[PDB]
Amino acid sequence: MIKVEIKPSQAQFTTRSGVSRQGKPYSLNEQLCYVDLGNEHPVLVKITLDEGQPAYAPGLYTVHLSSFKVGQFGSLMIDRLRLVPAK
Amino acid sequence: MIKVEIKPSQAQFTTRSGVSRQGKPYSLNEQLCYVDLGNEHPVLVKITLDEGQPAYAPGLYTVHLSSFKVGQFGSLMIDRLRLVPAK
């Protein structure tokens, strides 16, 4: 439950394409947000979109708890930025 | 909130120590807490503790935003999980 803002400027996503072996292409797409991390000042964080799921419209979003995950040696983590209209 | 709690049996830490592959010394203390990330039940999570830092004491907690950093391409990561008391 973090403030995320997408300003109109940020509405289109941004690419970083690619490939690995057995069936593993890295052809990455990213969109950007301003995240207020407590501070009076916003941070440009990046959102990595997963296949078939799209760039968020402009507006105000909260970070959704499924955005967090528990890793290999038991640490909690942002796996991917997950947003909701929630307010 | 990222709802967190340390029960009586969890109010303490374990030390793991050995050596880093840049041949550097570690002596890391770890503690378990229950995190409510949604799901239907409490997921168990590992707080790594800072040098000096006493293991937190039983109770209700919430995650403090100082736990989230940003680097490289606007990449958000949890740095340390710093919990503060509930309200």
UniProtKB/Swiss-Prot annotation, chains A, B:
Single annotated GO MF: single-stranded DNA binding
Spell out the InterPro entries in the cross-references.
NA-bd_OB-fold (IPR012340), Phage_M13_G5P_DNA-bd (IPR003512)
Which residue windows are transmembrane per the record? Answer: none
Gene Ontology biological process terms in this record = DNA replication; rolling circle single-stranded viral DNA replication
Record note on quaternary structure: Homodimer.
Which family does the record claim for this protein?
A: Belongs to the inovirus G5P protein family.
Q: What is this protein called?
A: DNA-Binding protein G5P
**Source organism (scientific name):** Enterobacteria phage f1
Q: What taxonomic lineage is listed for the species of origin? A: Viruses, Monodnaviria, Loebvirae, Hofneiviricota, Faserviricetes
| Encoding gene, per UniProt annotation | V
